[PDB]
């Protein structure tokens, strides 16, 4: 099972995040990159709703049937954060399924929602 | 999920918000909302297989139609102001199960449904 998310915001923050889960009860691999960030730590969360009608504001609270807390990503001096996470709480199926929800990258370490996108099914 | 929502955006002026509701599991899905920035007339309105916007609408993949068409919601009609008001009931798509469209892509096309180019699209997200 595979998913993807394109992060976009009001400013320079943008990225593409990939998800892969080999077995329904196994870890989800999350990888990709985010650009346009301030150097240092940024909160990285799945929020409850895949509702982008008001940009990141409409995504609702953190997903927590917290399940949606993926930790922090770290941006380098050029503002680029590499994402390489293995997470065994989120899922691409069942009750912890994050497909159709919103991925958000935050201004501060685990602030304002800098960029987000709806998590979609990928090839 | 009993409700979904999709924000349509493209490289041009076509934009809209489409809502989906399925209050009963395996029941009909109501689809409604508005799309603007269209040329007057009919435009193909389809669910495509992948919720992949990495290359805009070009990465949405084929018309959704699992071999295991489903994704064909028909045409929307734009008026002289370029606005298409949408109100459809579809009992083939679903917000769960084999025909689930959550996390897939909704696309509005250039021509009536070959529906031609993909004017705008968005990933279908959980709304409730
Ligand atoms: Zn958050
Ligand atoms: Zn199509």
Curated annotation (Swiss-Prot), chain A:
<dbReference type="GO" id="GO:0070062">
    <property type="term" value="C:extracellular exosome"/>
</dbReference>
<dbReference type="GO" id="GO:0019226">
    <property type="term" value="P:transmission of nerve impulse"/>
</dbReference>
<dbReference type="InterPro" id="IPR024134">
    <property type="entry name" value="SOD_Cu/Zn_/chaperone"/>
</dbReference>
<dbReference type="GO" id="GO:0005764">
    <property type="term" value="C:lysosome"/>
</dbReference>
<dbReference type="GO" id="GO:0071276">
    <property type="term" value="P:cellular response to cadmium ion"/>
</dbReference>
<feature type="modified residue" description="N6-succinyllysine">
    <location>
        <position position="77"/>
    </location>
</feature>
<keyword id="KW-0225">Disease variant</keyword>
<dbReference type="GO" id="GO:0060052">
    <property type="term" value="P:neurofilament cytoskeleton organization"/>
</dbReference>
<dbReference type="GO" id="GO:0006801">
    <property type="term" value="P:superoxide metabolic process"/>
</dbReference>
<dbReference type="GO" id="GO:0046620">
    <property type="term" value="P:regulation of organ growth"/>
</dbReference>
<dbReference type="GO" id="GO:0035865">
    <property type="term" value="P:cellular response to potassium ion"/>
</dbReference>
<dbReference type="GO" id="GO:1904115">
    <property type="term" value="C:axon cytoplasm"/>
</dbReference>
<dbReference type="GO" id="GO:0097332">
    <property type="term" value="P:response to antipsychotic drug"/>
</dbReference>
<keyword id="KW-0597">Phosphoprotein</keyword>
<dbReference type="GO" id="GO:0042803">
    <property type="term" value="F:protein homodimerization activity"/>
</dbReference>
<feature type="binding site">
    <location>
        <position position="62"/>
    </location>
    <ligand>
        <name>Zn(2+)</name>
    </ligand>
</feature>
<dbReference type="GO" id="GO:0043087">
    <property type="term" value="P:regulation of GTPase activity"/>
</dbReference>
<dbReference type="GO" id="GO:0043524">
    <property type="term" value="P:negative regulation of neuron apoptotic process"/>
</dbReference>
<dbReference type="GO" id="GO:0034465">
    <property type="term" value="P:response to carbon monoxide"/>
</dbReference>
<feature type="modified residue" description="Phosphoserine">
    <location>
        <position position="91"/>
    </location>
</feature>
<keyword id="KW-0449">Lipoprotein</keyword>
<dbReference type="GO" id="GO:0001541">
    <property type="term" value="P:ovarian follicle development"/>
</dbReference>
<keyword id="KW-1015">Disulfide bond</keyword>
<dbReference type="GO" id="GO:0010467">
    <property type="term" value="P:gene expression"/>
</dbReference>
<dbReference type="GO" id="GO:0032991">
    <property type="term" value="C:protein-containing complex"/>
</dbReference>
<dbReference type="GO" id="GO:0019430">
    <property type="term" value="P:removal of superoxide radicals"/>
</dbReference>
<dbReference type="GO" id="GO:0050766">
    <property type="term" value="P:positive regulation of phagocytosis"/>
</dbReference>
<keyword id="KW-0832">Ubl conjugation</keyword>
<keyword id="KW-0049">Antioxidant</keyword>
<feature type="binding site">
    <location>
        <position position="47"/>
    </location>
    <ligand>
        <name>Cu cation</name>
    </ligand>
</feature>
<comment type="function">
    <text>Destroys radicals which are normally produced within the cells and which are toxic to biological systems.</text>
</comment>
<dbReference type="GO" id="GO:0008270">
    <property type="term" value="F:zinc ion binding"/>
</dbReference>
<dbReference type="GO" id="GO:0030346">
    <property type="term" value="F:protein phosphatase 2B binding"/>
</dbReference>
<keyword id="KW-0186">Copper</keyword>
<dbReference type="GO" id="GO:0042542">
    <property type="term" value="P:response to hydrogen peroxide"/>
</dbReference>
<dbReference type="GO" id="GO:0005737">
    <property type="term" value="C:cytoplasm"/>
</dbReference>
<dbReference type="GO" id="GO:0031267">
    <property type="term" value="F:small GTPase binding"/>
</dbReference>
<dbReference type="GO" id="GO:0060088">
    <property type="term" value="P:auditory receptor cell stereocilium organization"/>
</dbReference>
<dbReference type="GO" id="GO:0051881">
    <property type="term" value="P:regulation of mitochondrial membrane potential"/>
</dbReference>
<dbReference type="GO" id="GO:0060087">
    <property type="term" value="P:relaxation of vascular associated smooth muscle"/>
</dbReference>
<dbReference type="GO" id="GO:0046716">
    <property type="term" value="P:muscle cell cellular homeostasis"/>
</dbReference>
<keyword id="KW-0564">Palmitate</keyword>
């Amino acid at each position: 099972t595979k998913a993807v998310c394109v992060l976009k915001g009001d400013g320079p923050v943008q990225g593409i995040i990939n998800f892969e889960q080999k077995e329904s009860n196994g870890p989800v691999k999350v990888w990709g990159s985010i650009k346009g960030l301030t150097e240092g730590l940024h909160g990285f969360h799945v929020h409850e709703f895949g509702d982008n009608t008001a940009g990141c504001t409409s995504a609702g609270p953190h997903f927590n049937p917290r399940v949606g807390d993926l930790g922090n990503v770290t941006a380098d001096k050029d503002g680029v954060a590499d994402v390489s996470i293995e997470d065994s709480v989120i899922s691409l199926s069942g009750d912890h399924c994050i497909i159709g929800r919103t991925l958000v990258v935050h201004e501060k370490a685990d602030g304002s929602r800098l960029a987000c996108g709806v998590i979609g099914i990928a090839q």
